[PDB]
Write an enzyme that holds these catalytic residues in place. Structure first.
Site, mmCIF file in Angstrom:
data_model
loop_
_atom_site.group_PDB
_atom_site.id
_atom_site.type_symbol
_atom_site.label_atom_id
_atom_site.label_comp_id
_atom_site.label_asym_id
_atom_site.label_seq_id
_atom_site.Cartn_x
_atom_site.Cartn_y
_atom_site.Cartn_z
ATOM 1 C CG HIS B 41 -0.224 -2.456 -1.434
ATOM 2 N ND1 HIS B 41 -0.472 -2.206 -0.102
ATOM 3 C CD2 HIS B 41 0.028 -1.251 -1.999
ATOM 4 C CE1 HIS B 41 -0.421 -0.904 0.121
ATOM 5 N NE2 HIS B 41 -0.115 -0.301 -1.014
ATOM 6 N N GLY B 143 0.115 7.190 -2.366
ATOM 7 C CA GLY B 143 1.563 7.157 -2.314
ATOM 8 C C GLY B 143 2.181 7.653 -1.021
ATOM 9 C CB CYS B 145 1.427 3.073 0.685
ATOM 10 S SG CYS B 145 -0.335 3.116 0.534
#
Lengths: 306, 306
Positions: B41, B143, B145
């Site tokens: 993503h 962020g 991730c």
């Protein structure tokens, strides 16, 4: 989102840990440039520890009595001095992996990460606080002596603690990296009393702010109170009294959440008297004091390092 | 002596973290040899996440749309494929600091360490468990991730988790390093229910043994009980039922302490019914289930790594 007792990344400290052997004793040492730092009681037998005369013991030791091992490569000892309770083994090979470092002596209530080591090899890392009685509640087995505590300021490693002693009580004591104990302790195998421990009130308030940032708000009440009346309740429950420097440190936590320090205290005051009544805050059934205000800001903003 | 939620030393993972940028989005990636791994993503805008068609989105992307940054040095993308929910960005420079690694998919109840990162830079490390409903209760901001979870087997790093999603509930979800989610989750911005969570009973029993190893013995009682009757009490309180494989895993903990698993269960049974009555075990006012039996043996014996 979420809140965890977070340690600093340990990479820069790992490459600094060596194994130090003198006679039968082996513990950990810290290899910065061409100096190795380790507890001076590496020169003691289990018998010596009852009543060691470190000067006389050190005199019967020569440079070739110390086996420093950095992985699979032995180091060479060129000089030894005793700085307070640490031995400085000057060696020939400087550590290529030596980071930008700093020796600092922390104050009670501050937090740091411990890199627990055995035989010079990293075993694990955890975060802990220096208690108001200058002990730490760590996890240390035999031969974890020499393990170090540290903070990271962007690229600079600040070394603040070296483990020396475990007490019958389950608590741990150590020195700064200049060899001065934190607390009234000595490196000898005898009964030694730590002070009464107290709860670090400013830390607890930083954790309540962390809870509000994460959606736990039930402890929030409508009352307020004064510093003076709060401190009277806190001193009943063995909490550190709050000063104005403490209110200021919590300023940014207050501005980002629009709740006044004194309002937070009034919630706390109630929590000490009325209790938790089986509820929890950020998953815990007890008030937590091992997060400093800076710890909370770091975890709620995403501060990074080298 | 002492007991702490201990993480693995993070050094070998730090040198593997890179920053990945595609369009406006920036998250973390894992740079092993000449492949970078990151959540797919990264190719989505905040608008795309509501209903992404990843195949079509990936088609409008070419190798030069991805900015991989490993510190102050940009990497060059030569090829991209999508393996399940991870993007593999094949790059030119292989990572010199690539450790001996392994991709593993863990089972619920196992524990691992998370290296929380922002913009490709290590921020902190903590230990956590995979819940029986395949979530984790982490600490992750926007962020984070791409941050990875891992275990260390002596010299081999076993990568087992990559963070993808944070849910309104405060819980976190992610994939293995082949890109298969743990749990019934998908990488899209929609309401998704996790299962009922349950307490990891085998872990709790390993923690009681840790408590006995550390001098907390008040919960020890005289009764015994059977597996079948215990499981009937446990299933009332949303505890994982105990099987015989569980009793065996706890064998070494039983041999080193001379207390029978079934005797420990009888203590636990009482603790669930009668409660804690305001006492604590190893400092906690609640039963802890984030230590596996192997975690306890590691911390009570001093296991080290490369």
């Amino acid at each position: 989102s979420g809140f965890r007792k977070m340690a600093f990344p340990s990479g820069k400290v790992e490459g600094c840990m060596v194994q130090v052997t003198c006679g039968t004793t082996t513990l950990n040492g810290l290899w910065l440039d061409d100096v190795v730092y380790c507890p001076r009681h590496v020169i003691c037998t289990s018998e010596d520890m009852l009543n060691p005369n470190y000067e006389d013991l050190l005199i019967r030791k020569s440079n070739h009595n110390f086996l420093v091992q950095a992985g699979n490569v032995q180091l060479r000892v060129i000089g030894h001095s005793m700085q307070n309770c640490v031995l400085k083994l000057k060696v020939d090979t400087a550590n290529p992996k030596t980071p930008k470092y700093k020796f600092v002596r922390i104050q009670p209530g501050q937090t740091f990460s411990v890199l627990a080591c055995y035989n010079g090899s990293p075993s694990g890392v955890y975060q802990c606080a220096m208690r108001p009685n200058f002990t730490i509640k760590g996890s240390f087995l035999n031969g974890s002596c020499g393990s170090v505590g540290f903070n990271i300021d962007y690229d600079c490693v600040s070394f603040c603690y070296m483990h020396h002693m475990a007490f019958p009580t389950g608590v741990h004591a150590g020195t700064d990296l200049e060899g001065n104990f934190y607390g009234p302790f000595v490196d000898r195998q005898t009964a030694q009393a730590a002070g009464t421990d107290t709860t670090i009130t400013v830390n607890v308030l930083a954790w309540l702010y962390a809870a509000v940032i994460n959606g736990d708000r039930w402890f929030l009440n409508r009352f307020t109170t004064t510093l003076n009346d709060f401190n009277l309740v806190a001193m009943k429950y063995n909490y550190e009294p709050l000063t104005q420097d403490h209110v200021d440190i919590l300023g940014p936590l207050s501005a980002q959440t629009g709740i006044a320090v004194l309002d937070m205290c009034a919630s706390l005051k109630e929590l000490l008297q009325n209790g938790m009544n089986g509820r929890t805050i950020l998953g815990s059934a007890l008030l937590e004091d091992e997060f400093t205000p800076f710890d909370v800001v770091r975890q709620c903003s995403g501060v990074t390092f080298q």
